[PDB]
Design an enzyme around this catalytic site. Structure first.
Site, PDB file in Angstrom:
ATOM      1  N   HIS A  10      -2.372   7.233   0.241  1.00 39.88           N
ATOM      2  CA  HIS A  10      -1.327   6.391  -0.353  1.00 39.88           C
ATOM      3  C   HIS A  10      -1.376   4.958   0.207  1.00 39.88           C
ATOM      4  O   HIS A  10      -0.873   4.689   1.300  1.00 39.88           O
ATOM      5  CB  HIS A  10       0.043   6.993  -0.089  1.00 39.88           C
ATOM      6  N   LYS A  34       0.421   7.858 -11.061  1.00 43.09           N
ATOM      7  CA  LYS A  34       1.579   7.639 -10.202  1.00 43.09           C
ATOM      8  C   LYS A  34       2.856   7.499 -11.038  1.00 43.09           C
ATOM      9  O   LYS A  34       2.934   6.684 -11.975  1.00 43.09           O
ATOM     10  CB  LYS A  34       1.353   6.408  -9.341  1.00 43.09           C
ATOM     11  N   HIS A  50       6.801   9.147  -6.693  1.00 39.93           N
ATOM     12  CA  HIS A  50       7.822   8.527  -5.862  1.00 39.93           C
ATOM     13  C   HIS A  50       9.121   9.220  -6.224  1.00 39.93           C
ATOM     14  O   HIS A  50       9.757   8.895  -7.239  1.00 39.93           O
ATOM     15  CB  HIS A  50       7.919   7.030  -6.114  1.00 39.93           C
ATOM     16  N   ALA A 106      10.860  -4.458   0.273  1.00 42.78           N
ATOM     17  CA  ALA A 106      10.579  -3.188   0.886  1.00 42.78           C
ATOM     18  C   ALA A 106       9.083  -2.984   1.085  1.00 42.78           C
ATOM     19  O   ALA A 106       8.288  -3.176   0.155  1.00 42.78           O
ATOM     20  CB  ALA A 106      11.125  -2.068   0.004  1.00 42.78           C
TER      21      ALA A 106
HETATM   22  N1  LIG Z   1       7.433   1.899  -0.167  1.00 42.15           N
HETATM   23  C1  LIG Z   1       7.807   0.623  -0.162  1.00 42.15           C
HETATM   24  O1  LIG Z   1       8.801   0.288   0.468  1.00 42.15           O
HETATM   25  N2  LIG Z   1       7.127  -0.295  -0.852  1.00 42.15           N
HETATM   26  C2  LIG Z   1       6.015  -0.038  -1.754  1.00 42.15           C
HETATM   27  C3  LIG Z   1       6.487   0.728  -2.995  1.00 42.15           C
HETATM   28  C4  LIG Z   1       6.559   2.255  -2.918  1.00 42.15           C
HETATM   29  O2  LIG Z   1       5.773   2.982  -2.247  1.00 42.15           O
HETATM   30  O3  LIG Z   1       7.462   2.794  -3.577  1.00 42.15           O
HETATM   31  C5  LIG Z   1       5.420  -1.369  -2.197  1.00 42.15           C
HETATM   32  O4  LIG Z   1       4.578  -1.351  -3.124  1.00 42.15           O
HETATM   33  O5  LIG Z   1       5.780  -2.459  -1.652  1.00 42.15           O
HETATM   34 ZN   LIG Z   2       6.879   4.869  -3.382  1.00 46.03          ZN
HETATM   35 ZN   LIG Z   3       3.685   3.238  -2.140  1.00 44.32          ZN
END
Ligand SMILES: NC(=O)N[C@@H](CC(=O)O)C(=O)O
Ligand SMILES: [Zn+2]
Ligand SMILES: [Zn+2]
Ligand SMILES: O=C1C[C@@H](C(=O)O)NC(=O)N1
Ligand SMILES: [Zn+2]
Ligand SMILES: [Zn+2]
Lengths: 343, 343
Positions: free
Chosen positions: A13, A99, A136, A263
């Site tokens: 991942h 995904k 997800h 994030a």
């Molecule tokens: N996990 C995260 O906080 N960020 C991931 C997105 C994801 O894996 O859902 C991203 O692409 O920035």
């Molecule tokens: Zn994710």
């Molecule tokens: Zn991710």
């Protein structure tokens, strides 16, 4: 002093982004991992074979000479995706998996799936052809507390889905809860999960006590300590349907450190050593290789790597920052010491 | 457009900081509020009568010509504080109240309290002389989840303390939980509470869904929605021992939008209109004046203000930022259109 030799790992991942960011980040992966599942949440998302072919080549262009790294591409599921597009990419060796991003659940997800019902013909095609579904697993209704979104997904989406398509292979990506840990532990051989280093090493206190730490802000959100502890127990038990998935997810520093921070943890530089620390702490190093280098290949039906790497228990300080063309990139554990490093 | 006229309010929980920052922020309070409880958490803290006297004068120096504003000073409780010093400050009208921050066994005796048991002499003195204790009611042990810290304080500290010192008057500052709302609702005439505008308007989803928002990061941390709703119901009930305390807590933009964001919302500029919005939404505007202008005075044994201010229900844009000598301040609701503003 202590040296730990493992079969070369893979990363099931990964986010590599595109353009200059891709050029900056790929070597942190390609120097270590034999293969990586490359997620498709670009803007615009990778939803066709042609886009995936070109993206793969941009990725290869950025891999230093002497690194034997193979990117495994994925399709970004959308409500309107043609199953023939998806299957063609699978048949041509372009798409390794697809995904599922619940619409508006996460980064670059506004084009994601709105219901499992809208994409049933696509899922039915994947089940037929043996293409794994990466999920997800969070619900998104505005009134559901963010910390409950993973658990709620299990009951309301994951379990009905798996009951409907009993031959579908599913990876529950970056699990963060006891709820998901138990669900996966009690599942069948067509269900697996990935876990990030941050969800093993930390819980929400680490992100919120003594200050708010946006470089620990990622989705699914860090949970309560008891969830962290369940995740550590799962990997440490030797359960063979969990495997390494960093969810390395880089954002420029001032995109993270802003009034509305993005994030994602940029953990590719430090993930492997961080996993090693966790397994060591759990008295479970005997299971470390399988997590890194065996369990994923087995679930995906791919051969294990035929080369080996070594980790040494010698303390390295992590860089405070990594240069980009504009701004910097702040690595996971920036400025800190890590106990294991790659020899 | 609708006009809402109230007796001039007071702010029963305020951070004014010091130096240049104080000069910038004081006018946002002094233009509107007749009095404010000025918290003592300077660096170093206000723990003596002399320090409080000098701080009061620095505050008065920064009040714009014509504003009728009186700062009500506080003493920071510490292990080393002499109860005679506190009593003297109370008797001389210097200290209106004393503030108890969370205990910490490793804190310097000059800067804090190691355990509540250790400062019983000073707490007994406050009980004796009728001085109110203001409590930031959290237990900050490393093994307590951050969202659990307020509830743990109720059980571990607040109830035992009030059972031990039955005459002690206590304000449970900035309550954030249904636990605390119920506790205060079910208490006696010696227990009251303040509530901030952010804990009425928002819950933790607003800080964490779609991005991490450090300008909503404050202590005690925003809780899940059920807690927010209990707070709204409490102020809406007309319960008369809850009152306005903004906990306006300014930090420069670069200290908020960093790798480790400081806790606190700069809400003095927008708090009063925000409370009006909440009371209106709760169909409880008949209780709004008492919350802002009567309940606090009654609890502290001080007169109600005899002048009036008016809020107008006309839309206005909140500033994106407010200049400091160095850097900038981002106000609560920066850049938003707000429903109520002062005439
Ligand atoms: N996990 C995260 O906080 N960020 C991931 C997105 C994801 O894996 O859902 C991203 O692409 O920035
Ligand atoms: Zn994710
Ligand atoms: Zn991710
Ligand atoms: O307890 C506190 C302290 C305050 C401050 O910054 O002074 N900020 C907060 O968010 N709460
Ligand atoms: Zn406080
Ligand atoms: Zn405060």
């Amino acid at each position: 002093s202590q040296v730990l030799k493992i079969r070369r790992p893979d990363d099931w991942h990964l986010h590599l982004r595109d353009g200059d960011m891709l050029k900056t980040v790929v070597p942190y992966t390609s120097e270590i991992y034999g293969r990586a599942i490359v997620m498709p949440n670009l803007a615009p998302p990778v939803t066709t074979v042609e886009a995936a072919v070109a993206y793969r080549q941009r990725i290869l262009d950025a891999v230093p000479a002497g690194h034997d790294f193979t990117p495994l591409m994925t399709c970004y599921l959308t409500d309107s995706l043609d199953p023939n597009e998806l299957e063609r990419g699978f048949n041509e060796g372009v798409f390794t998996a697809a995904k599922l991003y619940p619409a508006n659940a996460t980064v670059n997800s506004s084009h994601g799936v709105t219901s499992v019902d809208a994409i049933m013909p696509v899922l039915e095609r994947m089940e037929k052809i043996g293409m794994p579904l990466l999920v997800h697993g969070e619900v998104t209704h505005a009134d559901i507390d963010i910390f409950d979104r993973e658990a709620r997904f299990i009951e309301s989406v994951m379990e009905p889905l798996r009951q409907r398509l009993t031959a579908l292979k599913v990876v529950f990506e970056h699990i963060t809860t006891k709820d998901a840990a138990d669900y996966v532990r009690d599942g069948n051989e067509r269900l697996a999960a990935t876990i990030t280093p941050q969800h093993l090493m930390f819980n929400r206190n680490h992100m919120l006590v003594g200050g708010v730490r946006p470089h620990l802000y990622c989705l699914p959100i860090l949970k309560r300590n008891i969830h962290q502890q369940a995740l550590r127990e799962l990997v440490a038990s030797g359960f063979n349907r969990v495997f390494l998935g960093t969810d390395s997810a880089p954002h420029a520093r001032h995109r993270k450190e802003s009034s509305c921070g993005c994030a994602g943890c940029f953990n590719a530089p430090t993930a492997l050593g961080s996993y090693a620390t966790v397994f060591e702490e759990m008295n479970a190093l005997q299971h470390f290789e399988a997590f890194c280098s065996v369990n994923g290949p087995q679930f995906y039906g791919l051969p294990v790597n035929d080369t080996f790497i070594e980790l040494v228990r010698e303390e390295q300080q992590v860089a405070e920052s990594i240069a980009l063309t504009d701004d910097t990139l702040v690595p996971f554990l920036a400025g800190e010491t890590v106990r294991w490093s790659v020899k």
